[PDB]
Amino acid sequence: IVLTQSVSLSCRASQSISNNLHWYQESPRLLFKSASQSISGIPSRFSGSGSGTDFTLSINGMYFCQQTNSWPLTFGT
Amino acid sequence: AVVTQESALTTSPTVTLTCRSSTGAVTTSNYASWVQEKPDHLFIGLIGGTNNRAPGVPARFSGSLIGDKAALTITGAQDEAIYFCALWFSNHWVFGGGTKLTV
Amino acid sequence: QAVVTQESALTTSTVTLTCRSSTGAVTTSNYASWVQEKPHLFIGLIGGTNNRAPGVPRFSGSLIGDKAALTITTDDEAIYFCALWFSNHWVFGGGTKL
Amino acid sequence: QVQLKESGPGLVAPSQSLSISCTVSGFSLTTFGIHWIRQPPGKGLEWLGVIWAAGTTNYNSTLKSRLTITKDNSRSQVFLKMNSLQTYDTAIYYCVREDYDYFFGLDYWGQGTSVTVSS
Amino acid sequence: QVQLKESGPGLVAPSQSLSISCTVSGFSLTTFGIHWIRQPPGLEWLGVIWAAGTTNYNSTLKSRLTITKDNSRSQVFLKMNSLQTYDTAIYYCVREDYDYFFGLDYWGQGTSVTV
Amino acid sequence: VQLHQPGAEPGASVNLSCKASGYTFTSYWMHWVKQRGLEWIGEINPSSGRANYNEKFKNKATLTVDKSSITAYMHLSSLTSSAVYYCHWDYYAMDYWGQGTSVT
Amino acid sequence: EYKVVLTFGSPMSPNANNKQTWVNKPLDAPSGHYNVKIAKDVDHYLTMQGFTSIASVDWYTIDFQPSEAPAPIKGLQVLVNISKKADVYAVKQFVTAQTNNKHQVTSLFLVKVTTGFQVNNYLSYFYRASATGDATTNLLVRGDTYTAGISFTQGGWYLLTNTSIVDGMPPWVWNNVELKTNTAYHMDKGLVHLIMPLPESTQMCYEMLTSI
Amino acid sequence: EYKVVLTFGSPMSPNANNKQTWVNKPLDAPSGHYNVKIAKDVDHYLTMQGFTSIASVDWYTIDFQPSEAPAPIKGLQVLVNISKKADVYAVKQFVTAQTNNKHQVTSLFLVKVTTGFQVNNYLSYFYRASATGDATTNLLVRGDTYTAGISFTQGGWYLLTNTSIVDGAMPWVWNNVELKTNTAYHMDKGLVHLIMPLPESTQMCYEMLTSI
Ligand SMILES: *[C@@H]1O[C@H](CO)[C@@H](O)[C@H](O)[C@H]1NC(C)=O
């Protein structure tokens, strides 16, 4: 699976992966679980959406987008 | 269960027909319905569920529940035929004796 | 839930007593137990058709043919009773006034 | 437009099976149930049976032993099987569509086949 | 050395109640069930309570027969309703093992309940 | 609660390890990452000892976590010419990261 | 009011006798597909969460006296998109009290399909982790969805379901809420067959009404 | 043969409605303690693993008609050490074949305590870790075992259990086997109540034999 990443940060998948895409942001720190669920301790400014294959990030190394639909769970640029 | 209806009625160009039940009070759970019969056995559905009117029926037809008997009221009757009321009894419709409406 | 029949009487000076049932299944489920009698003391002699109660001597149960039977290989004069568990209870036979 | 038509033998001797197939048209047979209403001569209607849209059939209880309603979705043809016929069973037979989801009442009635039983 | 003993009225009138207490000794009621049998002047399976506290009555006699046992007090009671004239006999309470013997071993002397 | 690293740590098999402590839930599939962007290596359940190596990193990495106390042991073999480091042992949320054992 | 002795059929795809049961977790569906909504009116419907296939059904009275089949619940449609695809033949709602002000509702529906249809659904399952010592662990739901296809056969029975968490109770509840993540789900009679598909020929007799 | 209709009571010690169901995994106990064996004779006996509380029992015949409680199964006990502590009133064995070589066998014993007792046993709970993607994930049993006290009440109906993964060909089963730490377990009718304690007053139906 190939995920392309290009404020609103986008990480589009190469194939449908449902909603299995955690966002990862020193040791990288996670932001979202399942691409829409905010994680404990993160500021509420972060937001993550998308459900089928096109996942977007909006905030109001960078921010990797680890999809966990198939081994090996891949990462974005 | 037995559904009993008046044998005859008369009017001129409103009437009320009572669909009495032999078990207990008529409720929305019985899903009353009225089917008018014209000459030559031409049947049609004029009221369903005690509130719902079948497609194409004139707006003058109206039904409701009064007391323990379900009734259908005709406003501004112009309709002379035999009127049958059928009440759902949780497994099978039961059919009342014809009203024998006159105009 | 059937009936059970047993020999009316027997005479001797080895003897066996047979306990047949109307069903005739003669299954191990019957758990036949031959409780004896004395001039009105009823005692436990056998259980399950092959076991024995504590202190019982000669006595030995067996499943002969299709009718549960007992074995006695002058002090044994008794009206032996045969009981056969049906599914929920016991059904005693007439008993044998040996 | 919604239509319902009925075809029946028109005359059957006693103890001879009755076969009538009310071939509905204009409405799908898998959404609206089909009832069987028989109107004896000079009498009020009587319920016979119905075959629901999911195929569960409910008979009039008096006539459950003999009556048997089946259906063929592809050809949209509901069938009625009446065994052990009797003289008093003569009556005009109707097949009626019931909208048990929106209207809840018997909307459209069939023309009717006059089943006569005699010698 | 396991014994038994039943206290019975010894005389009753029809439609009355039969109260017979079958006491135990030399063992415990937490292991063996007590059977209730009668010997009208063969032997009739009246009813039984098991060690675990459930019971079973003759089908034809489930309305009138009630069996109750007192574990610590080592006592068993039988109460008969709608007593009839034909219920005269000596009533026996037999301890059934249903653990290693599947039978009847010790029987109480019995009490002539005469009606 | 926290994953700790046992030291920074060619051809010599070098386990790269990470021990999580103050943990209440055992079986959560500790991951394993190498960053010269991130690249998955494999994952081992702390319980059941089951691993699913990314095939690009099979025959070169062998992960085995201890049983009495959870601790990841990435038995790297035939090391070649960069650093391989952090591991993520998930939880209901927010407990799974450790300092990478940067290898040179 | 009847008793429904359900005889469980073979596992439906993508389930199987040797893998965790899959349930349509969220209330939405992938693009070009719809969820199976048991709808009375537009303001009252219970989405499908846990789908099951019933090989045969044996109805009874409340005292278990043999009885015939019931007429379909009138006014109730298992609409997928706008068009109906099945008839509902029973209903039942398990109201469990997780806490004094936390209630878990698990509606059930035994529906017979009039028109075969296939849909794709976001599926998930119930996972219980491992805890050291005697610490409590919650029978959670995996927050990771996985699109999959569910096939429903014409004229075949099915035991749909729905589960919801309601905080603060109405005096039948028409509340449809997703299967949450990080929320414990105490097991109830209407949820026991959603931890792993039961074998074929397994009977599970239920107390199912025939009206709201 | 009958068709029991159990009515599960409130969870037994140390289980609770808001916690996982504990099961006696190994076949031994700490010093000075014994397991709850269900022994037909000395050679054959199943080690009780799961325990549950039954409030009341209703017996219906095969065609579901009224019937009275049966006599206790003669020859079957529930031995703690060498002393009897209950009678078995209904037995059942749900045989499930994982594959040709591996078969699961869940045996359900319905007992009625004669004398109350309490023993200390090593406990554990069924668990199933989360999985990535859609791979099948097994329903294992934890490895650590938590020593906990178990209590039984005189006269209270109880439903025990015993699961043995009988490898190889086999005809009933008396193979007593531990709950293995890493063997995948299949969910059958005899394990539905061994995930979390069901709510009180829930009627789970079964079909139980009265003999071997
Ligand atoms: C290193 O890895 C091996 C497996 O290849 C393992 O047996 C060993 O315990 C690990 N480290 C230690 C502490 O020796």
Numbering used by the authors:
A (entry chain B): 2 to 7, 19 to 37, 42 to 76, 84 to 100
B (entry chain H): 2 to 14, 17 to 81, 84 to 108
C (entry chain F): 1 to 13, 17 to 42, 44 to 61, 63 to 78, 82 to 106
D (entry chain G): 1 to 119
E (entry chain E): 1 to 41, 44 to 117
F (entry chain A): 2 to 10, 14 to 40, 44 to 88, 91 to 113
G (entry chain C): 431 to 598, 600 to 602, 604 to 644
H (entry chain D): 431 to 601, 604 to 644
Give me lines lifted from the publication on this model:
The spike domain is known to be important for attachment and entry of the virus, and antibodies that target the spike domain have been found to neutralize HAstV in cell culture, whereas antibodies that target the core domain have not been reported to neutralize HAstV. Recently, two separate groups reported the identification of the neonatal Fc receptor (FcRn) as an important host receptor for human astrovirus entry, and FcRn was found to bind the HAstV capsid spike.
To define the full epitopes of antibodies 3H4 and 3B4, we solved the structure of both Fabs 3H4 and 3B4 in complex with the HAstV1 spike to 3.33 Å resolution using single-particle cryoEM. This structure reveals two novel epitopes, with a single Fab 3B4 bound to the top of the spike dimer interface, and two Fab 3H4 bound to the bottom sides of the spike dimer. All six of the 3B4 CDR loops interact with the spike, forming a hydrogen bond network primarily between spike residues G573-T577, and 3B4 residues S30-N32 on CDR-L1. The 3H4 epitope interaction is facilitated almost entirely by the heavy chain alone, with only W93 from CDR L1 and Y34 CDR L3 from the light chain making any contact with the spike. Notably, the salt bridge interaction by K504 appears critical to the ability of 3H4 to bind to spike as the mutation of K504 to a negatively-charged glutamic acid disrupts 3H4 neutralization of HAstV1 (27).
